[PDB]
């Protein structure tokens, strides 16, 4: 809860610092089974209202089983593709082998949770979240078969529809999502059962505690593959995550265009660092999550995902401190479009105000407390509640921290605009410097010949 921030005027960016990490590095495929029943043809005549409702519910149950059987049968372009349910697909193909469901059915016999070891060496954690065969057979089938379908009380039909609604909703979710459901809803895996699964995974106690304190971020980060209906059981695979990296320093970097503030519409040049997003620290190197929406955020912990990341050294933090350092090529992009905007940060709001746009920083009790001039500036969230740039009113976050301000000269006041390469999206500072030199080399060769 020690979140801070640091605006760097020299490059028009702001780095929050007081964060932690829970980086998803692997998967842990469970197996969730449901004991189905075999609906033997209800040979009974008589259409009382209770019998008719029981029949309608049984028909919805058979239809769910049938539908399930038919269901079975700035720098984000550098990530690299990866199958997300590859582990669940593999486990489904393994459970499709002959015998693997027989062993699962014999492990979850007296208990409601076991740890079965599949034939290919992997140890999976099976679980039996629902038992509908028991209710259906023992309660319903005698009343339907012996007494020629004469039901006494009306509580049994409500009981049956309550028990069946969860299977019907799992069927609906699978039917709509094409048999792969994310996030794992409360019908697939309830909260008590999710915590019972977390308390038995092969992980340290710190990871169990973290995953038990943020079960919503664990639902938002897993999948529920639909696997098999065979030997009178319904089984789907829940592809839970596991965070091997925990409690390390992460820092978000908010960038914004730093343009020259000349009067006209021409003769101006912009500049923008592209490496914006959540950085973290896992093992001797810096992870980089370029989208900043691949990472969920909690009170102080960033739940990132190493599938959508890039591994870099600590000279990224070096770029954060100083940008002309020789041990890293900081990534910038150029332009010529002086457009006014504002990047709402965590404990502040960057405000770039170019051209003839009218930008302000307004409180709520007093009113407009500041009037930004040409150039990108930054106000904290102590005496500010909204930020108005042009016709777009931006609100500011009321998180509590120690915002700073690091004064410096805008680096774009060093490039002569006559040679500034003004069209880039994956440039850097050494690349731009090489472009500028070759340009100056061309100029000197033209004027000395």
């Amino acid at each position, epitope marked *: 809860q020690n979140i801070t921030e640091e605006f760097y005027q020299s490059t028009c960016s702001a780095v929050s610092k007081g964060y932690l990490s829970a980086l998803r590095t692997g998967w842990y495929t469970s197996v969730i089974t449901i004991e189905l029943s075999n609906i033997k043809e209800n040979k009974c005549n008589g259409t009382d209202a209770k019998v008719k409702l029981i029949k309608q519910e049984l028909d919805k149950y058979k239809n769910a089983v049938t539908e399930l059987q038919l269901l079975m049968q700035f720098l984000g372009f550098l990530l690299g593709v990866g199958s997300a349910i590859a582990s669940g697909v593999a486990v489904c193909k393994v459970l499709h082998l002959e015998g693997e469901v027989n062993k699962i059915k*014999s492990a979850l016999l007296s208990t409601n949770k076991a740890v079965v070891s599949l034939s290919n060496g992997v140890s999976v954690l099976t679980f039996k979240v629902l038992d509908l065969k028991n209710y259906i057979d023992k309660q319903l089938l005698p009343i339907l078969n012996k007494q020629s379908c004469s039901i006494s009380n009306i509580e049994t039909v409500i009981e049956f529809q309550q028990k069946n609604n969860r299977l019907l909703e799992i069927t609906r979710e699978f039917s709509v999502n094409a048999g792969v459901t994310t996030p794992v809803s409360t019908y697939m895996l309830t909260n008590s059962e999710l915590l019972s699964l977390i308390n038995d995974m092969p992980i340290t106690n710190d990871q169990k505690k973290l995953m038990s304190n943020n079960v919503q971020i664990v639902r938002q980060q897993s999948y529920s593959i639909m696997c098999i209906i065979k030997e009178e059981v319904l089984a789907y695979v829940v592809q839970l995550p596991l965070y091997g990296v925990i409690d390390t320093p992460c820092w978000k970097l908010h960038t914004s265009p730093l343009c020259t503030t000349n009067t006209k519409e021409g003769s101006n040049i912009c500049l923008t660092r592209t490496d914006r997003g959540w950085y973290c620290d896992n093992a001797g190197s810096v992870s980089f999550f370029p989208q900043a929406e691949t990472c969920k955020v909690q009170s102080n912990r960033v739940f990132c995902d190493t599938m959508n990341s890039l591994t870099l050294p600590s000279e990224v933090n070096l770029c954060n401190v100083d940008i002309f350092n020789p041990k890293y090529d900081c990534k910038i992009m150029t332009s010529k479009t002086d457009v006014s905007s504002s990047v709402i940060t965590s404990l502040g709001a960057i405000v770039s105000c170019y051209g003839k746009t009218k930008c302000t920083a307004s409180n709520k009790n007093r009113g407009i407390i500041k009037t930004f001039s040409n150039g990108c500036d930054y106000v904290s969230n102590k005496g500010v509640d909204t930020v108005s740039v042009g016709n777009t009113l931006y609100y500011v976050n009321k998180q509590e921290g120690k915002s700073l301000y690091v004064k410096g000269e805008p680096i774009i006041n060093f490039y002569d605009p006559l040679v500034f390469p003004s069209d880039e999206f994956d440039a850097s500072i050494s690349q731009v410097n090489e472009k500028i030199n070759q340009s100056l080399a061309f100029i000197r060769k033209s004027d000395e010949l």
Partner: antibody
Amino acid sequence: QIQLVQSGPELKKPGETVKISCKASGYTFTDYSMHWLKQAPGKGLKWMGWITTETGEPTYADDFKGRFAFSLETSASTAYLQINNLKNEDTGIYFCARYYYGPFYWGQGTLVTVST
Amino acid sequence: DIQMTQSPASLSASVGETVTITCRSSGNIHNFLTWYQQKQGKSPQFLVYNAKTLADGVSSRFSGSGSGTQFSLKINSLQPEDFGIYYCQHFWTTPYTFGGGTKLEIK
């Protein structure tokens, strides 16, 4: 209430062809693939293979490859075996079984003796 | 090709003793085992669903134990019914194999 009724006894000659059938009532026949297990006089029990009750695709144990052939009729809810080129060693008791929770479920045997 | 072997290939007991049969697996069949018993010309009826959890319908004197590579069926008391041949089979992976068979007769 799960039943697997099997064919009756038989007597053949070496070099003939025989077809043993196994009827399966008490459950949805298309759920469990049916397994075939051979016994022998004095020897131990031998599991020979299974046949999926959806596609019919059979698979055989290395000791029972080449002549034994599995087949079924999904509509009739029954599966049968065929032992081509009977030999004096093919004599014994042949069992049809399916997966119970842990163990198998055996139907009564068919003593198939091959004498001359 | 996990091959299993039973130690008491023969056996003989009284009508009140507690006898124990063992099976040794040639591989790590973690927990999956079962014990059939064949009467005088019947089909092998199973006694346990697993190494430990016995099967419903049988008397409580049968008590299985073991894991991995060493299992033990124990008949806690003999009666005229508890006489036949006792096999043991793994159902961990294919192909399935049986024990040599344990013939139990009167003392």
